[PDB]
């Protein structure tokens, strides 16, 4: 426990991303498909990484595969916290669930890996309702679609983001 707090901006974004309110399709296009969390400059609060996010409206027009693009914004030599809204279909239901992703590559500096790992259990407790966790320590554990599909429902998942595995 490093004592790093979660900023009010992160809580509001997760609260909006968790529950869906009845809204016009223009506002539905503004829903966040993925978003990245990073440490502040003073390393005191967990804040939103500006510009590194995917909107629901962006999917299908500019972004072909939301997961393929989501992996790309992950830095190669830095640790990040990710919130990916996964849309997958198993053998008997179509599911839409939140996935909290801990990106800690081996190439990341030692100080970054230590703080992110030590404060992960503190931020995860503030983001109540998340039933899915993905801890990736290298690019090969996060780029493959079957890796998320294996975590979400194991072999029961037959489709991910509208595309068969």
């Amino acid at each position: 426990a490093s004592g790093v707090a979660v900023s009010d901006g992160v809580i509001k974004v997760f609260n909006d991303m968790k529950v869906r309110k009845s809204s016009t399709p223009e506002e539905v296009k503004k829903r966040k498909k993925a978003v990245l969390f990073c440490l502040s400059e003073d390393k005191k609060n967990i804040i939103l990484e500006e510009g590194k996010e995917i909107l629901v409206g962006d999917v299908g027009q500019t972004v072909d595969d939301p997961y393929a693009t989501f992996v790309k914004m992950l830095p190669d030599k830095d640790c990040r916290y990710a919130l990916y809204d996964a849309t997958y279909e198993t053998k008997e239901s179509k599911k839409e669930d939140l996935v909290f992703i801990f990106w800690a590559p081996e190439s990341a500096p030692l100080k970054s890996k230590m703080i992110y790992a030590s404060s992960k259990d503190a931020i995860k407790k503030k983001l109540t309702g998340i039933k899915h966790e993905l801890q990736a320590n290298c690019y090969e554990e996060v780029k493959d679609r079957c890796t998320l599909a294996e975590k979400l429902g194991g072999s029961a998942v037959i489709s991910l983001e509208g595309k068969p595995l």
């Binding site: 968790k18 869906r20 009845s22 008997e92 239901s93 599911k95 839409e96 039933k131």
Partner: protein
């Protein structure tokens, strides 16, 4: 955009009206330390807490825990605000009238739902099969109900309840798996045993003949892979576990099997409708998804019913979620919007309005 919630005995089915399958299917349990975890969250922590079933046998017993499950369904599973969508609830047969009003009070005062409708699970299964008269053998998680229905109205005096369902079969599967040297005891290994039951178990047409075949060859053996990579093999346990449905003495229970419960409930009805109920026996619930269960039920009931009666067991391929699918289509109809219990109608009549609007 309506919500359909099927409060099952052990599994809660939830989704949106107009969808083919429920969006969220999670266990209906509340966990407290041996501070409150509901659904899969209470299962991920495993054995540190103790688990309680508020609707253990179709009838809600702990209303405070039931509100937590409903709170978990709307906000965490369906990810919607209940005050913006009408919610269609389902209830077990022989549900006391006090429970119907309590559900009415909870929906409008705790969740402030704009509208609500309450339907009987057994009737919805029969409608989804295109029938108005028949007997629905609903075998769920914690309770098995045989509900004879005539012209869309269940006969309460002929409804029989059996406390023998998938939950008891899952526990029986551990007790027989330990005979092969495996050891499944913790709640974590309960879901592995449940997954084995749902994938490799089947109902044998002739149990005694199937036992001889399994003891003379290995053609019935199947292999299953544990999460940690270990592979286990099960043989005659494939058809011994679901055999407890037809022979409850395997679990030490005195009650009769599902075939005799179906026949006994039919004999409690009027003589002039018994012929119709014999040919319109509809299966429902998760516990009726074992391959070969429709053939076994046909063979068993025929041996009980008169030889001049024509027996047809109806097992639709989607009978696992027929209650929810039947409720989802009904809630999505434009003509059904006049059948809701509006909040304005709730303030004038109180919780008692559910008796005259949903029967």
């Amino acid at each position: 955009a309506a919500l359909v919630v099927d409060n099952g005995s052990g599994m809660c089915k939830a989704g949106f009206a107009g969808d083919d399958a429920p969006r969220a299917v999670f266990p209906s349990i509340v966990g407290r330390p041996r501070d409150s975890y509901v659904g899969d969250e209470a299962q991920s922590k495993r054995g540190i807490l103790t688990l309680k079933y508020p609707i253990e046998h179709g009838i809600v017993t702990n209303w405070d825990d039931m509100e937590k499950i409903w709170h978990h369904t709307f906000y965490n599973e369906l990810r919607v605000a209940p005050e913006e969508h009408p919610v269609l609830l389902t209830e077990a047969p022989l549900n006391p009238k006090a429970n119907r009003e309590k559900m009415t009070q909870i929906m409008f005062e705790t969740f402030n739902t704009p509208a609500m409708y309450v339907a009987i699970q057994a009737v919805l299964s029969l409608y989804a099969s295109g029938r108005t008269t028949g007997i629905v053998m609903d075998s769920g998680d914690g309770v098995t109900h045989t509900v004879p229905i005539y012209e869309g109205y269940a006969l309460p005096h002929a409804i029989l309840r059996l406390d023998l369902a998938g939950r008891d079969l899952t526990d029986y599967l551990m007790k027989i798996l330990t005979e092969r040297g495996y050891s499944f005891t913790t709640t974590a290994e309960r879901e592995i045993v449940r997954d084995i039951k749902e994938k490799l178990c089947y109902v044998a047409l002739d149990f005694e003949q199937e036992m001889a075949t399994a003891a003379s060859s290995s053609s019935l053996e199947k292999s299953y892979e544990l999460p940690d990579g270990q592979v286990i093999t099960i043989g005659n346990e494939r058809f011994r576990c679901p055999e407890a449905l037809f022979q409850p003495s395997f679990l030490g229970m005195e009650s009769a099997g599902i075939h005799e419960t179906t026949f006994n409930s039919i004999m409690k009805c009027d003589v002039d409708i018994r012929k119709d109920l014999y040919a319109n026996t509809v299966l429902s619930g998760g516990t009726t998804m074992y391959p070969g269960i429709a053939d076994r039920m046909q063979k068993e009931i025929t041996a009980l019913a008169p030889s001049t009666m024509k027996i047809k067991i109806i097992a639709p391929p989607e009978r696992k979620y027929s209650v929810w699918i039947g409720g989802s289509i009904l809630a999505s109809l434009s003509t059904f919007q006049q059948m809701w219990i509006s909040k304005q109608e709730y303030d004038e009549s109180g919780p008692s309005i559910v008796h005259r609007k949903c029967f």
